[PDB]
């Protein structure tokens, strides 16, 4: 459907080599998204205690 990222290929493909594509910014944004998802699951769990389904 959409289009993937391109950029200049000596810098674009270089982050697929070994463990080059794991700098501090990428690990930080991964730590953002897991932290968001556990809060979402906490709210979804906490809501159903009121309704009793």
């Amino acid at each position: 459907m959409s289009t993937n990222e391109n950029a200049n290929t000596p810098a674009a493909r270089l982050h697929r080599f070994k463990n080059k594509g794991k700098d501090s910014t990428e690990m930080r944004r991964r730590r953002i998204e897991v932290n968001v998802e556990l809060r979402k699951a906490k709210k979804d769990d906490q809501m159903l205690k009121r309704r009793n389904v």
Binding site: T9, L14, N19, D23, R31, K43, Q46
Partner: protein, 876 residues
């Protein structure tokens, strides 16, 4: 004074003349800009002047017309368009006359033409320019310098215009370019200029490339410049053969067979770097496109529909020719090399990895004899290539037939991680890390588990290029062992796993690896910290006193860093310092998530004092503010209702986190913290919420903040409604009016980058409505009378859910939240809702679409809502 002498003085090495001449040139540009431009055009067009003065004259025109900052470029084009048309015609005439009036080959006139045309081709104020350029190229009466400069001007133009304007004029410049790129031109500079021009003039040539007889000619003429003896022409022709494959797949069936295959293979086998690199990159792009086509061929086949585009399977058909070249290329490695230097040996590994994930189970019988014959070989390049070629093929095929290979390949890699050569050690550490990542249960097997741990603990002390590769293997191994024990150990948390006998000393060696003085090389400090976080998070119940020791050590380090801020002097000091603070904050989060509550109570005051001091003393810098807010959020979550003793000292920092709307990520963290804070503190959040609601309404009032902040504020309004309950009536009318205004907003359907935002805001509004209804409903067995303050809005809410029910495109969270709101409205009021819900059929469609969906919470909430609705309907 003539300006020629001023330019010659500006080129001169003495600053005593240079600065005065430069200031005179600037004052000439300020005093009368078009007269200065006219005189410089007169200087440029004369063949009798010195070439240095002409190039220095053209430099000012190039600087005046174009710039790299886009707003500066826009106002520069506007200030060009403000000049009278006759003077603009004079400089247009002189600059167009200059082409061909220079014997040197780099010329300023082509870039001057490009800037002039970029300033006014969207307004059609120069119709003669494209016929003049096409006529200059097409004229058979020689002058190679003019032809080269015109083709370079066309190539300069085609990369700077917005493509929607050149779509009008795409029939003539293609004629000029393909006339210039033909085989009979003797000068190779002309061929090189036309070949570099076609690479830019490609995105807006879709109508030409769709017609059969034109694209046949374009492909035939590009397929001749790959056989030029100049080699720069070879590189420039392969470079857009790659782009043609990338953009116009499904046209390539006629050409790929009896042309492009042989060209690309023979380019791969070359001994020149930049010519083999493009031959690798072509097949890498083919492997990208043929994986996307397979994803869509599965997705459409799930719904029973044929897909839009079928694949042709080029990469699967080319394996037996690609693999013996790709393996052989891996040996071309120098005895001294650099990490960031892209080269064909570094490209062949990435192409082999992509080929493995594309072709899957078929790649192994072509790779395995190479590793089998070159694992034992007294030469470090062939052994390093064998280890890398073994490590690339892991993610492709089926693990059930891939684990017996690595089971008997482990004792070779255990020995090979203690090699004389550093490069083989680094590659062996990488392949061991991939073994832990992709095939985890084959590594946990206790035949080789203790020597593997011994090898990794020994290799944590070696060179910085291999310790960093060891750290990711440790991070993967911890999760592998924890998940293997978590299957066995029942309900909550595993009591004892494979690494609990060795968790001590592993943790100690990581804490040693953190404090190396050479930690700035190859991400050593950060990779050690990420490994430490991943090992602490996946610990067993046996390993808890070690976690106590690590908590003490981490808090000691965090107390040390707060005194270190005044010793910073340079930019690199701040760059390393901010990374250190971010890593320490994330490690503190992972420590706080794991410690027991009775021990979590004891460290809380010094943790909040250090977080408050690092929030105060640091001069913003964004990332430490975000990490401080998220660390406080996890501290609030683990501490529960006992957090309120720290609240009144935290309140102004919460306020300034909300009030500062310049950066949106810090206020996103602040509103998420407000949600967590009210959800933890429940009814005790009453005296602090007036400033919070005022700041949230002020943030809703501003119209230049980022759009992504707006969905979260409505959801935390729902959360504070649920936390407060009966005292929400003083804010109820205001938040209901803002919810009405938010629900009455709509946006265009044309882009999914707006449709996704529309779905997100719709989910937020539905969550806010469920929050206010459940908050006013109360916690008792009978509904409170305060729900009847919402009863005029029920028809509005039902019309709103009818309006979203009428749409044909939905995210599943929309129907999942809407079913819950319908259930809340069924429980909220009496039988009067029935004569309103019977009038709209699309909600009854949605309550079946939720149950037939595959996402589980939509099914459960829709079942609950339709159960309440059927219970209400049967009570006639």
């Amino acid at each position: 004074m003539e300006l020629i002498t001023i330019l010659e003085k500006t080129v001169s090495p003495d600053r005593l003349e240079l600065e005065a001449a430069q200031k005179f040139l600037e004052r000439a540009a300020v005093e009368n800009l078009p007269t200065f431009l006219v005189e410089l055009s007169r200087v440029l067009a004369n063949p009798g002047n010195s070439q240095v003065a002409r190039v220095a004259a053209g430099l000012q025109i190039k600087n005046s017309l174009t710039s790299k900052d886009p707003d500066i470029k826009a106002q520069y084009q506007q200030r060009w368009l403000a000049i009278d048309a006759n003077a603009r015609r004079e400089v247009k005439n002189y600059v167009l006359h200059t082409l061909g009036t220079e014997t040197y080959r780099p010329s300023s006139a082509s870039q001057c033409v490009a800037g002039i045309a970029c300033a006014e081709i969207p307004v059609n104020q120069w119709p003669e320019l494209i016929p003049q350029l096409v006529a200059n190229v097409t004229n058979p009466n020689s002058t190679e310098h003019m032809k080269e400069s015109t083709l370079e001007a066309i190539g300069y133009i085609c990369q700077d215009i917005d493509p929607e304007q050149l779509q009008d004029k795409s029939n003539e410049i293609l004629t000029a370019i393909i006339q210039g790129m033909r085989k009979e031109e003797p000068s190779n500079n002309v061929k090189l200029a036309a070949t570099n021009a076609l690479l830019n003039s490609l995105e807006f040539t879709k109508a030409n490339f769709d017609k059969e007889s034109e694209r046949h000619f374009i492909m035939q003429v590009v397929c001749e410049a790959t056989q030029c003896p100049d080699t720069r022409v070879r590189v420039a022709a392969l470079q857009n053969l790659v782009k043609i494959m990338s953009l116009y797949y499904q046209y390539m069936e006629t050409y790929m067979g009896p042309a492009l295959f042989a060209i690309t293979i023979e380019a791969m086998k070359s001994d020149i770097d930049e010519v083999a690199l493009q031959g690798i990159e072509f097949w890498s792009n083919v492997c990208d496109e043929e994986m996307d086509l397979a994803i869509e061929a599965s997705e459409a086949a799930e719904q029973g529909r044929p897909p839009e585009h079928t694949s042709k399977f080029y990469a699967k058909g080319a394996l037996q020719y690609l693999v013996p070249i790709l393996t052989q290329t891996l040996t071309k490695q120098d005895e001294n090399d650099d990490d960031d230097d892209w080269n064909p040996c570094k490209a062949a590994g990435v192409c082999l990895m992509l080929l493995a994930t594309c072709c899957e189970d078929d790649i192994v019988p072509h790779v395995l004899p190479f590793i089998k014959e070159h694992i034992k070989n007294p030469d470090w390049r062939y052994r390093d290539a064998a280890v890398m070629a073994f490590g690339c093929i892991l993610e492709g095929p089926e693990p059930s037939q891939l684990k017996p290979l690595v089971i008997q390949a482990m004792p070779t890699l255990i020995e090979l991680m203690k090699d004389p050569s550093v490069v083989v050690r680094d590659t062996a550490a990488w392949t061991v890390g991939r073994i832990c990542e992709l095939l985890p249960e084959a590594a946990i097997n206790d035949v080789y588990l203790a020597p593997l741990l011994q090898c990794l603990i020994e290799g944590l002390s070696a060179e910085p290029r291999v310790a960093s590769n060891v750290c990711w293997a440790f991070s993967s191994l911890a999760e592998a062992a924890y998940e293997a024990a978590d299957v066995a150990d029942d309900q909550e948390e595993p009591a004892t796993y494979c690494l609990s006998s060795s968790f001590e000393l592993i943790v100690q060696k990581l804490l040693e690896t953190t404090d190396r003085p050479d930690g700035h090389q190859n991400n050593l400090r950060s990779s050690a910290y990420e490994s430490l976080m991943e090992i602490v998070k996946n610990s067993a119940k046996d390993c808890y006193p070690a976690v106590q020791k690590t908590t003490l050590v981490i808090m000691e380090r965090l107390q040390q860093v707060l005194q270190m801020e005044s010793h910073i002097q340079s930019t690199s000091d701040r760059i390393q310092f901010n990374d250190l603070q971010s890593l320490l904050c994330a490690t503190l989060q992972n420590v706080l998530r794991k410690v027991q509550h009775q021990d979590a109570l004891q460290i809380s005051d010094v943790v909040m004092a250090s977080l408050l001091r690092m929030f105060q003393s640091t001069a913003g810098s964004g990332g430490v503010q975000e990490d401080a807010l998220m660390a406080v959020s996890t501290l609030v979550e683990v501490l529960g209702g006992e957090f309120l003793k720290y609240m009144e000292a935290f309140k102004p920092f919460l306020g300034i986190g909300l009030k500062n709307y310049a950066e949106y990520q810090v206020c996103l963290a602040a509103v998420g913290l407000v949600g967590d804070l009210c959800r933890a503190l429940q009814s005790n959040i009453i005296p602090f919420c007036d400033e919070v609601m005022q700041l949230l309404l002020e943030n809703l009032g501003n119209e230049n903040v980022h759009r992504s902040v707006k969905p979260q504020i409505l959801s935390v309004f729902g959360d504070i409604a649920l936390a407060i309950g009966g005292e929400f009536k003083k804010y109820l009318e205001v938040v209901l009016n803002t919810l009405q205004q938010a629900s009455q907003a709509q946006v265009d359907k044309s882009d999914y980058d707006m449709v996704d935002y529309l779905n997100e805001l719709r989910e937020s509004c539905l969550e806010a409505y469920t929050g206010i209804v459940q908050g006013l409903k109360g916690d008792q067995e009978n509904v409170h009378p305060d729900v009847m303050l919402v009863q005029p809005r029920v028809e509005f809410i039902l019309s709103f859910i009818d309006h979203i029910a009428g749409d044909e495109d939905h995210t599943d969270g929309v129907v999942a939240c809407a079913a819950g709101l319908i259930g809340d409205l069924c429980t909220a009021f009496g039988k009067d809702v029935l004569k309103l819900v019977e009038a709209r059929p699309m909600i009854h469609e949605l309550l079946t679409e939720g149950r037939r969906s595959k996402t589980n919470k939509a099914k459960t909430l829709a079942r609950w809502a339709t159960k309440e609705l059927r219970k209400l309907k049967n009570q006639a």
